[PDB]
Amino acid sequence: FKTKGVLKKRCRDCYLVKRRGRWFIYCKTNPKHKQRQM
Amino acid sequence: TKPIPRPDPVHNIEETHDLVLKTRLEEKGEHLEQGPMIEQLSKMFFTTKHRWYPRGQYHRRRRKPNPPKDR
Amino acid sequence: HPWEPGSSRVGLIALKLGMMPLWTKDGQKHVVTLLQVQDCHVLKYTPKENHNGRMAALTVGGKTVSHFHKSASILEFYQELGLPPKQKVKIFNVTENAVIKPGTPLYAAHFRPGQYVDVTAKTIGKGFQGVMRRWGFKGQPATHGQTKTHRRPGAISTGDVARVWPGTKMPGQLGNIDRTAFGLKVWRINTKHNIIYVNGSVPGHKNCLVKIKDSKLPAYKDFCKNLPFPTYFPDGDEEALPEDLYDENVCQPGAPSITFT
Amino acid sequence: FREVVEILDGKTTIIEGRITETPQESPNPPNPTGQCPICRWNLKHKYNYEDVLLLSQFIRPHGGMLPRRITGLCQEEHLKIEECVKMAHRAGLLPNHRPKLPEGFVPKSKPRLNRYLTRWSPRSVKPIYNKGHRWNKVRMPVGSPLLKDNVSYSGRPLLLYH
Amino acid sequence: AAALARLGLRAVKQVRVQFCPFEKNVESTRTFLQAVSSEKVRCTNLNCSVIADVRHDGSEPCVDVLFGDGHRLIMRGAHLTAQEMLTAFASHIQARG
Amino acid sequence: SSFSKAPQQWATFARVWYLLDGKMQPPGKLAAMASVKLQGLHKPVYHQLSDCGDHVVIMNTRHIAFSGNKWEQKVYSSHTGYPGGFRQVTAAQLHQKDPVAIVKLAIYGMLPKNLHRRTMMQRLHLFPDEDIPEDILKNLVEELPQPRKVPRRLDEYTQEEIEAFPRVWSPPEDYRL
RNA sequence: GGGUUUACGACCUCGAUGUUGGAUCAGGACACCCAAAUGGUGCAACCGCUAUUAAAGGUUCGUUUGUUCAACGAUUAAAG
RNA sequence: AGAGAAAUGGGACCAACCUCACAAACGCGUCUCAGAGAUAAUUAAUGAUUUAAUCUUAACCUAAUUAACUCAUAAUAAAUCCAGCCCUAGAACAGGGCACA
Numbered sequence: 001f002k003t004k005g006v007l008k009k010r011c012r013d014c015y016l017v018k019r020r021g022r023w024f025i026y027c028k029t030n031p032k033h034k035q036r037q038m
Numbered sequence: 039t040k041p042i043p044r045p046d047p048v049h050n051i052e053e054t055h056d057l058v059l060k061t062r063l064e065e066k067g068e069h070l071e072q073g074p075m076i077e078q079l080s081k082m083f084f085t086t087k088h089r090w091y092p093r094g095q096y097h098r099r100r101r102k103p104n105p106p107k108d109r
Numbered sequence: 110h111p112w113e114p115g116s117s118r119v120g121l122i123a124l125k126l127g128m129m130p131l132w133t134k135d136g137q138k139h140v141v142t143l144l145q146v147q148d149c150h151v152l153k154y155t156p157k158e159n160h161n162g163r164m165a166a167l168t169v170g171g172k173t174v175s176h177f178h179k180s181a182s183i184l185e186f187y188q189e190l191g192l193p194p195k196q197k198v199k200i201f202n203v204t205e206n207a208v209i210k211p212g213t214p215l216y217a218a219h220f221r222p223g224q225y226v227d228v229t230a231k232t233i234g235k236g237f238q239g240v241m242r243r244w245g246f247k248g249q250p251a252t253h254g255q256t257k258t259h260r261r262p263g264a265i266s267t268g269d270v271a272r273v274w275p276g277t278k279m280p281g282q283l284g285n286i287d288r289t290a291f292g293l294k295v296w297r298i299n300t301k302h303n304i305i306y307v308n309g310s311v312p313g314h315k316n317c318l319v320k321i322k323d324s325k326l327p328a329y330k331d332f333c334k335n336l337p338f339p340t341y342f343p344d345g346d347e348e349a350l351p352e353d354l355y356d357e358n359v360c361q362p363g364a365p366s367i368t369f370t
Numbered sequence: 371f372r373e374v375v376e377i378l379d380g381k382t383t384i385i386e387g388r389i390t391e392t393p394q395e396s397p398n399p400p401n402p403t404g405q406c407p408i409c410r411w412n413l414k415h416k417y418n419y420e421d422v423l424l425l426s427q428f429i430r431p432h433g434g435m436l437p438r439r440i441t442g443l444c445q446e447e448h449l450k451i452e453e454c455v456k457m458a459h460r461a462g463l464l465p466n467h468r469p470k471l472p473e474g475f476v477p478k479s480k481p482r483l484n485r486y487l488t489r490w491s492p493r494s495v496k497p498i499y500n501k502g503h504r505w506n507k508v509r510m511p512v513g514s515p516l517l518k519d520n521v522s523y524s525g526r527p528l529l530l531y532h
Numbered sequence: 533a534a535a536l537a538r539l540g541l542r543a544v545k546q547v548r549v550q551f552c553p554f555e556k557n558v559e560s561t562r563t564f565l566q567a568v569s570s571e572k573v574r575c576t577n578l579n580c581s582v583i584a585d586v587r588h589d590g591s592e593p594c595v596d597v598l599f600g601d602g603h604r605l606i607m608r609g610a611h612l613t614a615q616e617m618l619t620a621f622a623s624h625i626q627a628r629g
Numbered sequence: 630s631s632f633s634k635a636p637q638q639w640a641t642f643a644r645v646w647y648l649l650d651g652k653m654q655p656p657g658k659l660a661a662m663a664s665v666k667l668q669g670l671h672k673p674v675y676h677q678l679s680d681c682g683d684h685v686v687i688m689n690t691r692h693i694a695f696s697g698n699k700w701e702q703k704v705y706s707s708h709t710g711y712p713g714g715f716r717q718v719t720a721a722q723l724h725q726k727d728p729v730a731i732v733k734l735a736i737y738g739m740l741p742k743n744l745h746r747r748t749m750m751q752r753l754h755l756f757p758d759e760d761i762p763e764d765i766l767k768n769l770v771e772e773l774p775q776p777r778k779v780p781r782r783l784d785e786y787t788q789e790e791i792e793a794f795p796r797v798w799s800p801p802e803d804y805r806l
Numbered sequence: 807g808g809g810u811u812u813a814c815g816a817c818c819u820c821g822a823u824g825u826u827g828g829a830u831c832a833g834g835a836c837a838c839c840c841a842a843a844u845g846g847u848g849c850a851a852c853c854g855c856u857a858u859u860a861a862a863g864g865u866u867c868g869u870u871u872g873u874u875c876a877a878c879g880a881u882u883a884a885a886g
Numbered sequence: 887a888g889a890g891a892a893a894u895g896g897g898a899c900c901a902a903c904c905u906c907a908c909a910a911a912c913g914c915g916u917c918u919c920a921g922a923g924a925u926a927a928u929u930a931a932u933g934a935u936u937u938a939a940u941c942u943u944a945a946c947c948u949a950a951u952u953a954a955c956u957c958a959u960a961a962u963a964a965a966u967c968c969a970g971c972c973c974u975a976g977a978a979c980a981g982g983g984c985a986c987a
């Protein structure tokens with residue numbers, strides 16, 4: 001996971017979900033694309 | 039309105055000696071310490087324990103003996 | 110009442126005699142303390158709702174003392190009970206199924222060889238002692254120039270706080286306080302003289318009263334199943350127990366001088 | 371309303387669709403000229419989290435929201451109704467709109483805390499430990515900001531943050 | 533059709549869709565037929581047999597799927613959505629297959 | 630009107646016991662009227678030097694209701710004085726530990742900040758549920774109205790009112806709920 | 807965004823706020839060294855690198871230098 | 887995952903050794919050290935707004951889950967006799983003994 005202030009997709013498989021009061025860019029193909037809005 | 043309740047029961051009456059039965063309900067007494075006495079008074083009158091304590095000479099001298107009265 | 114898994118048992122009030130060694134069959138050596146159950150009587154019983162709302166309370170008295178030094182209320186209580194006055198009066202929190210009628214004596218056979226107990230007593234009161242003996246603070250060097258500081262506690266707080274914190278360790282009273290040791294194993298039970306051999310150090314000076322109870326540790330919470338649930342009744346079994354109830358590992362005084370093989 | 375019925379008869383599954391009767395709209399609307407349902411029933415700036423009879427018209431039996439393309443509401447009022455449904459569900463209204471679980475209804479838990487006019491989710495907010503001073507105050511939000519245009523008979527603005 | 537392509541439809545024997553093109557509820561039926569007759573479903577398994585029965589007075593579209601677990605899934609889809617039929621068929625063949 | 634001086638004074642400065650239900654009620658709106666009745670700001674004979682104060686019995690304390698997400702956001706911080714003894718308890722945790730403490734602290738804060746706060750607090754009675762002793766129940770005079778109107782549930786509406794409330798939209802039959 | 811070094815201004819004290827290092831005592835913050843739960847790795851495993859949450863507890867013994875620092879010896883789970 | 891051993895620190899004591907020319911004090915010597923909930927980050931179960939999927943500032947129940955922090959549990963928890971003499975109790979004040987001998 002990478003904590004960032006501005007999230008953005010890196011491939012066409014990353015999906016943005018609203019969880020725990022924050023935004024999460026989750027990617028199943030490349031797990032290194034996991035982003036979390038701080 | 040609702041009727042006036044009246045409760046009258048003198049269980050201290052003995053069939054042996056009424057002169058003793060009358061005093062059986064009158065000779066009741068109880069003496070406690072300062073702490074428990076203040077606590078009971080506060081529990082009865084719904085106040086704190088800081089009021090029941092006495093005051094000093096400096097305050098008991100400066101009280102006006104004959105305060106004015108209206109009406 | 111029958112024994113229950115969530116049940117507890119009443120304790121005793123013994124007299125700490127002294128210390129002794131005790132060798133185990135494996136060659137090891139432990140240190141036991143002798144607790145003599147002189148007189149244990151159930152003075153009064155307070156109901157659960159009247160004491161705690163969860164567990165009932167039993168009042169236990171210690172050894173016998175003189176009537177010529179107790180007040181009017183205590184003497185009146187002991188007169189209405191029918192027993193001589195006791196020195197130390199303790200309270201034991203037991204369940205509602207292990208209640209006993211007040212006025213019943215208790216015997217040191219209440220516990221069996223092999224069990225864990227807890228011991229409560231007032232430790233040896235050393236009086237108003239310094240900080241090095243109270244909390245264990247280190248002192249300053251002895252002779253490198255220190256002037257009138259060989260045992261001072263030093264700084265007690267910081268600067269910006271402009272006060273000392275309530276939890277600051279300082280010299281004061283030391284020793285005279287009720288302490289409790291948990292998980293002391295009992296090895297030997299003497300029935301004739303009512304002596305209990307408790308392993309380890311027992312808080313409290315010798316010839317003092319000591320409150321013994323079942324170990325409330327979570328590892329020994331369900332050990333009261335094989336023991337007599339209410340108490341030890343010598344009249345119920347119609348059989349005299351041996352003089353000394355030894356544990357399954359205690360090297361008894363009469364031994365064949367075991368050797369390894 | 372359409373229902374999917376499944377029948378198990380000897381390793382043979384029969385899935386069928388059954389159409390039942392659904393109630394229609396009332397005959398006389400107060401403002402038939404409006405295109406949106408609420409905007410034509412003149413309930414705009416009138417409903418609230420308390421009005422359950424209005425919110426219960428379009429919600430799935432399992433508390434789910436109904437799609438806008440099937441409902442027909444304008445976007446703003448649809449968002450407002452979604453907020454109101456969330457707030458009612460959190461407050462404890464709509465008791466008959468929860469999924470039935472006979473295995474999970476047995477292990478009872480701590481009692482449900484009585485709440486109302488809640489904005490966020492009960493399991494996604496961290497408590498304020500600093501709480502701020504008077505000039506920089508961490509205000510506690512209550513109610514949805516989308517309903518700030520409701521009619522105020524008292525005239526005072528609705529405190530969305532306290 | 534991507535779902536049935538990635539679900540591994542090798543474990544089916546026969547799939548027949550019986551319908552009448554001159555009815556008023558054949559949209560979902562023909563959608564399901566095309567989704568199961570797509571090229572990816574064919575390349576997933578070649579041993580399966582896909583049949584499309586066309587009638588004129590049947591008035592009752594149906595889908596019969598016989599697969600080698602001794603199983604016969606019959607779905608009389610006349611008002612069900614094509615997506616609902618597809619997901620139900622997929623769940624059933626994934627549970628028993 | 631023509632009373633003797635002693636009974637007139639007694640009736641004028643008598644104390645009154647009020648009842649207050651707290652089920653589904655906001656603690657702020659409860660403590661408002663609670664502090665009012667405690668300070669005695671409901672009597673035209675009120676004065677600061679005089680001890681005109683009334684008792685309030687609040688029931689259904691455990692069933693209190695907070696507005697918004699304050700149940701999880703609001704904290705109650707205390708300190709035992711000792712270093713590191715600074716505890717911050719969430720509102721929900723404090724309510725679970727002691728149900729009375731919430732409304733107790735609310736009223737203790739709404740009351741004035743003088744020494745009479747303890748005096749008028751000793752006159753307060755808070756009960757978690759409807760378990761009031763008889764010697765306290767027989768003191769009640771009247772019950773104050775609830776400050777917040779409790780909203781009905783869906784099953785609490787009658788079928789006649791349900792059918793009276795008109796249907797807004799006409800759902801199509803082909804859809805599946 | 808913070809006010810931890812230097813400097814900047816001289817607002818409070820020059821009819822006194824006694825100035826570095828050590829001994830004792832530590833309190834607090836997390837921008838976490840270990841111990842705890844995890845994500846990602848050009849993570850094969852042991853060793854590693856970063857990110858998240860977490861402060862109830864610890865963070866050594868010696869030679870030299872007055873030394874804070876600094877180099878070295880031996881360790882620890884670590885010598886913040 | 888399963889068995890043990892040790893140290894630190896909290897709390898205690900002299901059976902033995904050690905200091906020990908007072909009967910005690912002491913360590914270098916000996917004994918004990920714990921059950922439940924909760925979570926922050928992070929995973930999965932059903933499921934709509936978005937008739938698919940999706941851990942949900944969508945509800946309802948779900949589960950493995952850091953440390954704190956509380957609670958089970960334990961410690962005190964019988965009040966109005968105290969002249970004098972002792973105490974392993976103590977600055978004074980307090981506390982426990984003075985019937986078996």
Ligand SMILES: [Mg+2]
Nearest residue numbers: 234235236975
């Ligand atoms: Mg002493």
Ligand SMILES: [Mg+2]
Nearest residue numbers: 247248249250
């Ligand atoms: Mg020294």
Ligand SMILES: [Mg+2]
Nearest residue numbers: 253254255256
């Ligand atoms: Mg000198």
Ligand SMILES: [Mg+2]
Nearest residue numbers: 254255256257
């Ligand atoms: Mg000098």
Ligand SMILES: [Mg+2]
Nearest residue numbers: 255256257259
């Ligand atoms: Mg000297």
Ligand SMILES: [Mg+2]
Nearest residue numbers: 269270271272
């Ligand atoms: Mg200050």
Ligand SMILES: [Mg+2]
Nearest residue numbers: 269809810811
């Ligand atoms: Mg500074």
Ligand SMILES: [Mg+2]
Nearest residue numbers: 812813814815
């Ligand atoms: Mg500058």
Ligand SMILES: [Mg+2]
Nearest residue numbers: 817818819823
């Ligand atoms: Mg100045």
Ligand SMILES: [Mg+2]
Nearest residue numbers: 819820822823
């Ligand atoms: Mg100066």
Ligand SMILES: [Mg+2]
Nearest residue numbers: 819821822823
């Ligand atoms: Mg001066």
Ligand SMILES: [Mg+2]
Nearest residue numbers: 712832833834
């Ligand atoms: Mg510190």
Ligand SMILES: [Mg+2]
Nearest residue numbers: 836838859860
């Ligand atoms: Mg942090």
Ligand SMILES: [Mg+2]
Nearest residue numbers: 838840841842
């Ligand atoms: Mg670590």
Ligand SMILES: [Mg+2]
Nearest residue numbers: 861862863864
């Ligand atoms: Mg620390």
Ligand SMILES: [Mg+2]
Nearest residue numbers: 895896897918
């Ligand atoms: Mg130790």
